[PDB]
Amino acid sequence: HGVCWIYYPDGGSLVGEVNEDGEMTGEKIAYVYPDERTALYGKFIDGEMIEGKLATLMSTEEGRPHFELMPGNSVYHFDKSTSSCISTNALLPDPYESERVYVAESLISSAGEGLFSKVAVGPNTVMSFYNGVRITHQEVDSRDWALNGNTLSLDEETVIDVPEPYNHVSKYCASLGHKANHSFTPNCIYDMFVHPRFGPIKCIRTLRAVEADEELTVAYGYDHSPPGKSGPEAPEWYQVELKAFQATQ
Amino acid sequence: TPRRSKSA
Numbered sequence: 001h002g003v004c005w006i007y008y009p010d011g012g013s014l015v016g017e018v019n020e021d022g023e024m025t026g027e028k029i030a031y032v033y034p035d036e037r038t039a040l041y042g043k044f045i046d047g048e049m050i051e052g053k054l055a056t057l058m059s060t061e062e063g064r065p066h067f068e069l070m071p072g073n074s075v076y077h078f079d080k081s082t083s084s085c086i087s088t089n090a091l092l093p094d095p096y097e098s099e100r101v102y103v104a105e106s107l108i109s110s111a112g113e114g115l116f117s118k119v120a121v122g123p124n125t126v127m128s129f130y131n132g133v134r135i136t137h138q139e140v141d142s143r144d145w146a147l148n149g150n151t152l153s154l155d156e157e158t159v160i161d162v163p164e165p166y167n168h169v170s171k172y173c174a175s176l177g178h179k180a181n182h183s184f185t186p187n188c189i190y191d192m193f194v195h196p197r198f199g200p201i202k203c204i205r206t207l208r209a210v211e212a213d214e215e216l217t218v219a220y221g222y223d224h225s226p227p228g229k230s231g232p233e234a235p236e237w238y239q240v241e242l243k244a245f246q247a248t249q
Numbered sequence: 250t251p252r253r254s255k256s257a
């Protein structure tokens with residue numbers, strides 16, 4: 001029997017034996033996270049996760065992976081959000097993310113909560129996921145900023161959002177990317193990611209080495225010179241910090 | 250003026 005490994009540009013991968021139709025279908029298929037250690041092992045159909053259990057990729061021999069199931073009952077499955085449903089299990093955290101980041105009071109004055117690293121990692125490390133409901137750019141761009149605190153463009157046709165009350169960890173903790181605060185000197189970036197549970201979303205990836213307990217920040221990238229109106233389209237707190245920065249140094 | 254979401 002032959003084994004196929006399909007790596008996504010983000011570092012994650014699908015591995016297992018394919019059927020006659022050459023499809024990733026069976027009870028022994030697995031999605032392996034970017035650390036090439038954490039995995040979701042179980043039932044998949046044509047590469048789509050039906051029932052994946054947390055496991056650890058122990059070793060690989062001639063392309064053949066050996067997994068060891070983690071103790072526990074938590075199960076995961078493809079659960080792509082819609083414009084109204086963010087998740088079937090809002091309180092089930094992502095296992096990879098749970099070992100890399102945590103939420104706490106931000107070190108940035110009056111910035112509420114922030115996202116912090118649990119471990120020291122090197123450059124280009126995926127740390128968190130930015131899942132949320134999927135809505136149009138027209139809907140987002142047509143409403144008050146008060147409702148767009150957590151909106152992130154996925155692509156030309158979709159915007160990901162984490163609307164109230166899901167912006168509270170007590171109501172939603174499946175992903176935590178929306179908890180990272182803004183910085184004009186960020187240590188992370190938002191990057192494309194294909195997640196076995198959340199589907200196509202964005203992730204938070206480090207730009208360089210980060211230490212344990214260091215706050216993770218990303219440049220929100222709001223339009224500073226929007227064509228059609230001489231005024232940076234962004235919330236007040238952003239415009240304030242922007243001026244302070246452009247004057248800082 | 251139009252875009253009101255993260256990422257530049």
Ligand SMILES: Nc1ncnc2c1ncn2[C@@H]1O[C@H](CSCC[C@H](N)C(=O)O)[C@@H](O)[C@H]1O
Pocket residue numbers: 106108109110111112113114149150167178179180181182183237241
């Ligand atoms: N550099 C900064 N200065 C002040 N507020 C910031 C900031 N970066 C982010 N924020 C705040 O972050 C919200 C971003 S969502 C990030 C999580 C948020 N601080 C929380 O506690 O849920 C924004 O609406 C704004 O209130």
